[PDB]
Amino acid sequence: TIPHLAIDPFSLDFFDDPYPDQQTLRDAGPVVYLDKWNVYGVARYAEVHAVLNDPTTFCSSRGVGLSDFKKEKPWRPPSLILEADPPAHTRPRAVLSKVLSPATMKTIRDGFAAAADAKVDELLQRGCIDAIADLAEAYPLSVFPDAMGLKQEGREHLLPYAGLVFNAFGPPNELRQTAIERSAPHQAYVNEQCQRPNLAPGGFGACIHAFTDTGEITPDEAPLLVRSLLSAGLDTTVNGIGAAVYCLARFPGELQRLRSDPTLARNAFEEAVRFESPVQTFFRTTTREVELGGAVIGEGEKVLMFLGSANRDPRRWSDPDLYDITRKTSGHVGFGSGVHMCVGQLVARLEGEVMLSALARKVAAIDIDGPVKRRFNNTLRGLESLPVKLTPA
Ligand code: HEM
Ligand SMILES: O=C(O)c1ccc(C2CCCCC2)cc1
Numbered sequence: 001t002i003p004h005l006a007i008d009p010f011s012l013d014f015f016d017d018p019y020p021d022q023q024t025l026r027d028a029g030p031v032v033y034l035d036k037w038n039v040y041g042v043a044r045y046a047e048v049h050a051v052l053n054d055p056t057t058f059c060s061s062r063g064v065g066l067s068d069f070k071k072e073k074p075w076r077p078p079s080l081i082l083e084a085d086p087p088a089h090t091r092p093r094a095v096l097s098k099v100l101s102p103a104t105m106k107t108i109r110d111g112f113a114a115a116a117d118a119k120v121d122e123l124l125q126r127g128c129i130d131a132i133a134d135l136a137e138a139y140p141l142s143v144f145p146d147a148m149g150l151k152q153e154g155r156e157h158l159l160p161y162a163g164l165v166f167n168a169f170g171p172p173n174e175l176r177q178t179a180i181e182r183s184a185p186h187q188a189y190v191n192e193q194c195q196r197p198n199l200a201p202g203g204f205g206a207c208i209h210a211f212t213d214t215g216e217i218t219p220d221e222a223p224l225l226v227r228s229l230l231s232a233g234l235d236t237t238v239n240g241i242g243a244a245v246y247c248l249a250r251f252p253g254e255l256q257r258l259r260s261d262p263t264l265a266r267n268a269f270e271e272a273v274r275f276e277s278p279v280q281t282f283f284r285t286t287t288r289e290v291e292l293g294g295a296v297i298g299e300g301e302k303v304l305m306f307l308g309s310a311n312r313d314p315r316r317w318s319d320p321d322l323y324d325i326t327r328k329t330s331g332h333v334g335f336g337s338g339v340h341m342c343v344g345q346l347v348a349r350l351e352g353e354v355m356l357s358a359l360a361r362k363v364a365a366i367d368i369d370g371p372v373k374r375r376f377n378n379t380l381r382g383l384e385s386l387p388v389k390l391t392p393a
């Protein structure tokens, strides 16, 4: 009944060009079995959306990586929010939601926008830049660690730590095992910055700790919640912004539409998140026997969701393989869906918006002018290097 495929979605070959294999996964059926890792897979929009929106059946507390926490030891203590189910999930979620709220966005927006404009001005002075190191990485590094309240020293640990986190959701292949064996100094740095004294007044970290007397979280929960933001909050945005620049670089017609109306900046970023899906995959674990897309899945089974595939499913999208900055994007699953839907999406969208706004106002053309190199990660899709010439408006 369920088709068995030998495709390895965590192989370098797959990362290098996932789109044909994603169609093969979609068209094989609503539910497939991946013999390579003994997991179920769903690659169509409908089943991905259904799985995300039934957290009781498709739980997160047994891990959202390949590893089943019921069978193996987690590589680090479980996240109090990502790797928790309701009801344990609910209060920590509410705290991060309030920390990363509308009001907070108002407090940081001017600074984020100023930093974006400044960066683009700087890059225009150079002309030929690497849109990954010099923009997609440099810009979030120039705003997010400060917004967290982190000291300057040690910040070089942040991207390596995130690379590790996202590789660790994968199977135990070379990417994952290499990441873990290099991890000790990055874990040590992160865990230390999560303590209250090390987080500057007014930043996200301090704000999490301040919530520890409302009864929503205890003081001993705050460091792990700071840890959540230091795991999730930087490398995601690097690859979201890199995706957007890469799209504008390949679709100059859409860059020209964006220039003509910079208020399209926020939807141009959202469309990039759909189109590239910086977060490609992650898992749920079944808590009972369940019927999904006409297939029966047993209890205690890992289910791999292909978010990127769902976001290109022609069953859901018209011209899914086109970058269209006026597309109606609502419903894409690039930020997830349901109770775990990205709690930092307002920060992500703010960064993406103000960067694309700066590009929209200051740059006339973005031309790739060197070899493009891809970065491999078990969960993240993005580039290592994107050489571009920026022409000033
Ligand atoms: C373009 C950037 C981003 C993308 C594409 C993205 C994507 C996602 C997705 C797909 C999920 C759902 C995971 C699941 O269902 O298991 C998620 C959750 C989460 N994200 Fe984001 N994210 C981004 C940026 C951020 C930022 C900037 C922050 C923090 C400042 C953040 C913090 C979190 C946290 C803490 C969760 C867990 C939420 C929960 O379990 O309730 N993310 N993100
Ligand atoms: O430590 C945490 O709580 C944590 C770590 C990583 C993430 C990722 C965000 C992007 C989608 C996949 C999960 C979310 C939360």
Ligand SMILES: [Cl-]
Residues within 6 Å of the ligand: 076, 187, 190, 191
């Ligand atoms: Cl850690």
